[PDB]
Design a protein around this ligand. Structure first.
Ligand SMILES: CC[C@H](C)CN(C[C@@H](O)[C@H](Cc1ccccc1)NC(=O)O[C@H]1CO[C@H]2OCC[C@H]21)S(=O)(=O)c1ccc(OC)cc1
Lengths: 99, 99
């Protein structure tokens, strides 16, 4: 589809058997999800933006379905105020900026 | 143009007669630029990112050129890690997401 930017580009995603709303974020190198209890091993990480840094847990090879498009890659989980789909997964679903 | 997301969507912008590099950021409601001198009046404002809130200078109705596309709107100037172009200006240049 085509998504305009009048409002926040929120879309439904499916991860770990749960449906969630997430932001298609071309400014996010990586995908950062709100706190959730995923299984498997993880590695600590810190990511920075406006306001400073937050601590997150890096999970690798996590399947996410974004508007019916399947993608698999690294997913960070931490105290983010918003679910954020980053470029690592946006590429896998063929997402592009256009103007 | 059509922009894939395998690399950061960085572009050259023109503001206040100066050229700069900025990130097209669909996850940003507003445009936030690094510290710089801009002509005209400004009023203090606060914005929140993933790491907390920062103090910024709000410049209204600022002319800014993004890849030869003109925009006029609000520009926030503060300690952001990166020059980011938010939806307030991406809409002015007709920017959409497509997959
Ligand atoms: C360094 C580039 C940019 C600041 C990075 N951010 C993605 C943004 O899209 C962020 C994503 C975001 C969106 C809402 C709340 C927290 C973060 N939005 C944002 O900060 O926008 C601010 C400016 O306009 C306002 O509108 C929203 C907040 C304000 S981020 O959230 O901090 C981030 C996301 C993934 C990362 O992986 C390495 C690293 C950093």
């Amino acid at each position: 589809p085509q998504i305009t930017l009048w409002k926040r580009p929120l879309v439904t995603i499916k991860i770990g058997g749960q449906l969630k709303e997430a932001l298609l974020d071309t400014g996010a190198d990586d995908t950062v999800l709100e706190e959730m209890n995923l299984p498997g091993r993880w590695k600590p990480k810190m990511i920075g933006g406006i306001g400073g840094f937050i601590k997150v847990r890096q999970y690798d090879q996590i399947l996410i379905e974004i508007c019916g498009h399947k993608a698999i890659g690294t997913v960070l989980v931490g105290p983010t105020p918003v679910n954020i789909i980053g470029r690592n997964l946006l590429t896998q679903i063929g997402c592009t900026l256009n103007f």
